[PDB]
RNA sequence: CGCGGGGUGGAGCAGCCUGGUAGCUCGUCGGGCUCAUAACCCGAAGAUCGUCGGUUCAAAUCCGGCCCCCGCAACCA
RNA sequence: CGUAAAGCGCACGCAGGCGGUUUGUUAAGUCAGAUGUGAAAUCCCCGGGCUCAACCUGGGAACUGCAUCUGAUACUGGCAA
């Protein structure tokens, strides 16, 4: 809903990477350097975060599908909880190159997963040999990790919320290709060029990602309540 | 200095009625209009860009019965004039005396109209004019001289003209056999299957 | 309503261990004759498959050109790799006096009057890219005035 | 039979002219939606373009045959 | 003009080319106007005469130049600080 400088500063949003890894494009949002580490200017974070929240709310009210993309070890479970609890979709394992631009092929895999999953419930993996009941079970496990968050999406989304613009550059680029706006939490070592709603701030602390996700999940929840 | 070969052959090569016959019958009843002439006629000619430009130019030349040297002079004159080069070129071709006498209807075809002009049956503004290419000016009066006012070919040609779209820019009377060229026709009044830009482009290569 | 045109088909080879693998490339341009034009380059083992891939690719990734009554706004220059391309607005009736690839792209984009001249390598792929880049880097009085904070009459 | 027109998911319609793309509306299945239905939303399924042929790298499109449909067509004591 | 042809082996330096900023002045370059001249024909525009056309012809435009006179002083040049 609403966040403030104290909450961001308690969760450690102002901390950035070390100076020798920064992006010169990220200079405007940089406050200073302390002990060879950049410090992110929260006076820029707060209005940008609130402005991104407003745009996300408007999309949610118009029944837009939101794809929560975050795949680092520090934000995988965080992004899964936020998207389940906001009734939207997510990716929290390795992003498949071409999820969006190659949606036709990726969709065939979605159909395969649904059929395999229903067969498991029915009991189909009993007539076949034990090996065929472990192979298919292993296939279902892999397909769940990869496309288990977008099996019900059914189409190209209307916005992406990428936790790490650095790590998830492929997803951002596919979004830019298709036409889908990106809301991205962007650290000091990252490139904000492909992002439409930049949100400067630390993207590696579990506390910070939980902060961003709770606020974003509440906004989408309230916008669908409408 | 005039094409004397078969007429429907040109219409088949262009794949379009060139009005080279009077119109007593249908061109599909007189020839195989859908098939190009010659041994390899049924084949579908895949035409290059230079080919389409050349075929367009040849279509216009064969409609009006104008050879290449004179036609090139027309383009030069049209390009020199002010306005639009393609529309000017069509205007000159329409101003030829053979075309005018055909359009008012003292001739089944443009070949028949041309023979009348040549054989001194036509008068513009009261004077016998023998020159086919003679450019008629606005407000001119074209008449059939008294000596030739008897010809059955003229009578039947007038009847056939009643069966075609009557040009809006000339004023004809079939009782006196005299027409008035009021104004120069526009691109709205001419058949839009012509593509003049191809001719302009062709002559600009 | 989209007019399409195949500019060039070209046979290439790969020279695999067994010998030469011949495949085909097709360059096509599509446009709505009213300011939108795109180009598509497709490869395949057969000519129909190649042109089909190119046409589909070209229907996507189209762009919008600010056309002035079937003519250009002002003289433009386009450059891609070794191909330079000069284009100039002309007066109604001139026609499209352009080169080989430029002819197809301009006709399909709706330019009816232009004076064009390619300087440099006349490779069709690079020529098409340069002419489309020139048509895209061309601005109209409305956007120029908006950029400069004036009215169109102020800019004339 | 004569002349003209027509045939595209179950239904109703574009696409044909300029040869490269099966679109629009309803309907069907499944889900959400609704306590449920309805309304709404999202998917999923559904045509080989009447058929037989030719044209041509390529045909719903261009050409012909057959099939049907429709209008007109001169004939009822 | 790195590798396709193409940076002298390197430097100093006369002639030459180019010249930070301010004021004043001059008016050379520059610009504006005016005048003289730039033969006629030819090219171009609007007309006219040969039945049309080629051709001939009336008027105009043009001849992008040069010279002189009168002005402007932004910039370049000169001179002065
Ligand atoms: Mg001769
Ligand atoms: Mg060269
Ligand atoms: Mg060498
Ligand atoms: Mg060398
Ligand atoms: Mg050296
Ligand atoms: Mg030196
Ligand atoms: Mg100086
Ligand atoms: Mg002076
Ligand atoms: Mg003279
Ligand atoms: Mg005269
Ligand atoms: Mg004269
Ligand atoms: Mg000075």
Declared resolution, Å:
3.0
Q: Are residues B31 and B42 in the same domain?
A: yes
Give the rounded distance of the alpha carbon of B55 from its chain centre. 17
Q: Is position B19 within any domain?
A: yes
Using an 8 Å Cβ cutoff, are B125 and B141 in contact?
Answer: yes
Give the determination technique: cryo-EM
Where do runs of H (alpha helix) occur along chain C?
A: 47-59, 101-109, 124-136, 141-148, 152-155
Contact list, B83 vs chain C (CB under 8 Å) = 93
Residues B16 and B62 in one domain: yes
Place of tokens 């190159």: A97
Burial class (CB in 10 A: 0-12, 13-18, 19+), A31: middle
CATH code of the domain in which B99 resides: 3.10.290.10
Can you state the percent helix, strand and coil of chain C, rounding each to 5?
30, 35, 35
Can you give the CATH number for the domain in which B33 is found?
A: 1.10.1050.10
Strand partners, B170: B181
Question: Range of B13's domain?
Answer: 7-93+190-204
B80 within a domain of the structure (yes/no): yes
Say yes or no: B68 and B115 in one domain: no
- Written as one string, the DSSP assignment of B71-133 is HHHHHHHHHHSSS-HHHHHHHHHHHBHHHHHHHHTSSSSHHHHHHHHHTT-EEETTEE---TT
Pair (B87, B11) in one structural domain? yes
The tokens of A94 are what?
């390795």
Backbone phi, then psi, for B63, in 5-degree steps? -65, -50
CA distance B110 to B102: 6
CA A121 to mean position of chain CA atoms:
30
The DSSP call for residue B2 is: -
- The two tokens of residue A51 are 């402005």
In angstroms, rounded to a whole number, what is the distance separating the alpha carbons of residues B36 and B39? 9
Cβ neighbours of residue A201 closer than 8 Å, sequence gap 6 or more: A8, A13, A14, A40, A45, A49, A185, A186, A187, A208, A212
A103-147 fold: Helix Hairpins (1.10.287)
Q: Indicate if B150 and B127 belong to the same structural domain.
A: yes
Cα dihedral A168, A173, A176, A180 sign: negative
Domain assignment present for residue B158? The answer is: yes
CA–CA separation, A117 vs A128, rounded Å? 16
Question: Both ends of chain C: CA-CA distance in Å?
Answer: 34
Chains that touch A (3 or more CB pairs under 8 A): none
Distance CA C14, CA B197 (A): 43
Q: How far is CA C15 from the centre of its chain?
A: 32
Q: Kindly state whether residue B1 falls inside one of the protein's structural domains.
A: no
Count CA atoms closer than 13 A to A86's CA, side-chain side: 32
Cα(C91)–Cα(A161) distance, integer angstroms: 52
B119 plus B150 within the same structural domain? yes
Closest C-alpha to C113, from C50, C60, C51, C71: C71
C 72-131: CB under 8 A from B: 92-97, 103, 112
- Give the DSSP H or E segment for A67: strand A66-69
**Inside any domain, residue B185:** no
- The Cα of B186 is separated from the nearest Cα of chain C by a number of Å equal to 14
Q: CB-CB: which of B83, B87, B197 is closest to C95?
A: B197
Structure tokens at A58: 């408007």
- What is the DSSP secondary structure assignment for residue C19, as one 8-state letter? B
Structural domain contains residue B39: yes
* Structural domains counted in chain B: 2
A161 and A56 in contact (C-beta within 8 Å)?
yes
Q: How far is the CA of A175 from the C1' of E33 (A)?
A: 66
> Which residues lie near nucleic chain E, judged by CB under 7 A?
B 80-82, 127-131, 133-135
Q: Give bridge partners of residue A159 from the DSSP assignment.
A: A66
Q: How far is CA A33 from CA A19, A20, A45, in A?
A: 7, 11, 17
Tell me how far apart the alpha carbons of residues C42 and C55 are, in angstroms, rounded to a whole number.
8
Contact at 8 Å (CB) between B94 and B74?
Answer: no
Tell me which chain B residues have a C-beta less than 8 angstroms from the C-beta of C93: 83-88, 200
- Residues B140, B181: contact at Cβ < 8 Å? yes
Residue B127 lies in a domain: yes
Give C45's DSSP letter.
S
């Amino acid at each position: 809903a609403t966040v403030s400088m104290r909450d961001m500063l308690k969760a450690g949003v102002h901390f950035g990477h070390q100076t020798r890894y920064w992006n010169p494009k990220m200079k405007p949002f940089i406050f200073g350097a302390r002990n060879k580490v950049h410090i992110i200017n929260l006076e820029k974070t707060v209005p940008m975060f609130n402005e991104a929240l407003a745009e996300l709310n408007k999309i949610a009210s118009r029944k837009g599908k939101i794809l929560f993309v975050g795949t680092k070890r520090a934000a995988s479970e965080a992004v899964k909880d936020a998207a389940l609890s906001c009734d939207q979709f997510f990716v929290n394992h390795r992003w498949l190159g071409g999820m969006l631009t190659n949606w036709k092929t990726v969709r065939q895999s979605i159909k395969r997963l649904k059929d395999l999953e229903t067969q498991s419930q029915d009991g189909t993996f009993d007539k076949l040999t034990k090996k065929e009941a472990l192979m298919r079970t292993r296939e279902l496990e892999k397909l769940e990790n990869s496309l288990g968050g977008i099996k019900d999406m059914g189409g190209l989304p209307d916005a992406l919320f990428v936790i790490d613009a650095d790590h998830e550059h492929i997803a951002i680029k596919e979004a830019n290709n298709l036409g889908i706006p990106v809301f991205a939490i962007v650290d000091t070592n990252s490139d904000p060029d492909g992002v439409d709603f930049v949100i400067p701030g630390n993207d590696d602390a579990i506390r910070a990602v939980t902060l961003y996700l709770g606020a974003v999940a509440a906004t989408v929840r309230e916008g669908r309540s409408q | 200095a005039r094409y004397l070969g078969p007429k429907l052959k040109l219409s088949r090569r262009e794949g379009t009625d060139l009005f080279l016959k009077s119109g007593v019958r249908a061109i599909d009843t007189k020839c195989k209009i859908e098939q190009a002439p010659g041994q390899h006629g049924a084949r579908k000619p895949r035409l290059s860009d230079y080919g389409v430009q050349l075929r367009e130019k040849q279509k216009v030349r064969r409609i009006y019965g104008v050879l290449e040297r004179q036609f090139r002079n027309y383009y030069k004159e049209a390009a020199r004039l002010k306005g639009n080069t393609g529309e000017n070129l069509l205007a000159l071709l329409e101003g030829r005396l053979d075309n005018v006498v055909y359009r008012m209807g003292f001739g089944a075809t443009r070949a028949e109209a041309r023979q009348l002009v040549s054989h001194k049956a036509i008068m513009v503004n009261g004077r016998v004019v023998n020159i086919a290419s003679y450019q008629v000016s606005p407000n001119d009066v074209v008449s059939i001289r008294e000596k030739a006012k008897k010809q059955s070919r003229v009578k039947a040609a007038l009847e056939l003209a009643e069966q075609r779209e009557k040009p809006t820019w000339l004023e004809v009377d079939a009782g006196k056999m005299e027409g008035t060229f009021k104004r120069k026709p526009e691109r709205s009044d001419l058949s839009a299957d012509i593509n003049e830009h191809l001719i302009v482009e062709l002559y600009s290569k | 309503e989209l007019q399409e045109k195949l500019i060039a088909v070209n046979r290439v080879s790969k020279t695999v261990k067994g010998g030469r693998i011949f495949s085909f490339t097709a360059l096509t341009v599509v446009g709505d004759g009213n300011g939108r034009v795109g180009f598509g380059y497709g490869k395949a083992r057969e000519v129909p498959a190649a042109i089909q891939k190119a046409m589909e690719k070209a229907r996507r990734n189209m762009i919008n050109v600010a056309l002035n009554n079937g003519t250009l706004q002002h003289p433009v220059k386009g450059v891609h790799t070794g191909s330079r391309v000069f284009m100039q607005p002309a007066s109604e009736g001139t026609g499209i006096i352009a080169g080989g690839a430029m002819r197809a792209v301009l006709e399909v984009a709706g330019v009816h009057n232009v004076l064009a001249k390619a300087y440099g390598s006349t490779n069709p792929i690079n020529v098409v890219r340069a002419t489309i880049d020139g048509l895209e880097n061309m601005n109209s009085p409305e956007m120029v005035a908006a950029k400069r904070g004036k009215s169109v009459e102020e800019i004339l």
